[PDB]
Curated annotation (Swiss-Prot):
Gene that encodes the chain: RALA
Membrane-crossing segments per the record: none
Chief site of localization: membrane
Residues of the full protein shown: 11 to 178 of 206
Protein name: Ras-related protein Ral-A
Lineage: Eukaryota, Metazoa, Chordata, Craniata, Vertebrata
Subcellular location: Cell membrane; Cleavage furrow; Midbody, Midbody ring; Mitochondrion
Result, substituting V15M: In HINCONS; decreased GTPase activity; decreased RALA effector binding
GO biological process: cell division; chemotaxis; establishment of protein localization to mitochondrion; exocytosis; membrane raft localization; neural tube closure; positive regulation of epidermal growth factor receptor signaling pathway; positive regulation of filopodium assembly
Keywords: Cell cycle, Cell division, Cell membrane, Disease variant, Exocytosis, Glycoprotein, GTP-binding, Hydrolase, Intellectual disability, Lipoprotein, Membrane, Methylation, Mitochondrion, Nucleotide-binding, Phosphoprotein, Prenylation
Keyword match Cell membrane: yes
Gene Ontology MF term list: ATPase binding; Edg-2 lysophosphatidic acid receptor binding; G protein activity; GDP binding; GTP binding; GTPase activity; myosin binding; ubiquitin protein ligase binding
Effect of V15L: In HINCONS; decreased GTPase activity; decreased RALA effector binding
Enzyme Commission number(s) from the entry: 3.6.5.2
Length: 169
């Protein structure tokens, strides 16, 4: 009887998909989570006063068979597209995840946030706020910077994505 919001974490390696997920789920910064391990998490949460369930698929890039990975995308209702602000190549990689999602969901308004993680490493920044905001503007998505280490904006990205799912679906 509860809304079930199906969230999928995407992004290239080491950007913080798992750390964000585990901070959200378990209030812990986890620094050694197996890079090849994908997992699903489910939690009851109160979204704007409504009890809902969030399901998070923390993807780990291991499924290379395109039909299978497209099936995983098709199941998702919203996407956190994560890059690390400290790795420009991970920002460049977001374009591919966007295209993969769009090919399957066929809706440019699919619930989607662009997430610049590792905001606590400003001294290592390789991706400017300006360029990330410009990309988000091009895609008509919001850009949020997070830190799985300090928990900055972690609840925000999950809740705001659920708000998009709620509004759009
Ligand atoms: N300083 C800092 N390190 C982070 C952050 N998020 C992840 N890390 C570190 O980056 C590494 C990779 O994170 P992980 O979540 O496993 O990356 P994934 O491959 O995208 O799942 C780990 O050592 C984390 O501790 C963050 O926000 N800040
Ligand atoms: Ca991971
Ligand atoms: Cl796995
Ligand atoms: Cl799983
Ligand atoms: Cl609570
Ligand atoms: Na612009």
């Amino acid at each position: 009887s509860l809304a079930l919001h199906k969230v999928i974490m995407v992004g290239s390696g080491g950007v913080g998909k798992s750390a964000l997920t585990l901070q959200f789920m378990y209030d812990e910064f986890v620094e050694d989570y197996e890079p090849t391990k994908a997992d699903s998490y489910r939690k009851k949460v109160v979204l704007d006063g409504e009890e809902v369930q969030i399901d998070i698929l923390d993807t780990a890039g291991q499924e290379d068979y395109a039909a299978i990975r497209d099936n995983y995308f098709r199941s998702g209702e919203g996407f956190l597209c994560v890059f690390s602000i400290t790795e420009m190549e991970s920002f460049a990689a977001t374009a591919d995840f966007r295209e993969q999602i769009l090919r399957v969901k066929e809706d440019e308004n699919v619930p989607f946030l662009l997430v610049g993680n590792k905001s606590d490493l400003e001294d290592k920044r390789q991706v400017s706020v300006e360029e990330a905001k410009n990309r988000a503007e091009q895609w008509n998505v919001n850009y949020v910077e997070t830190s799985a280490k300090t928990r900055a904006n972690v609840d925000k990205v999950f809740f705001d994505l659920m708000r998009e799912i709620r509004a759009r679906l």
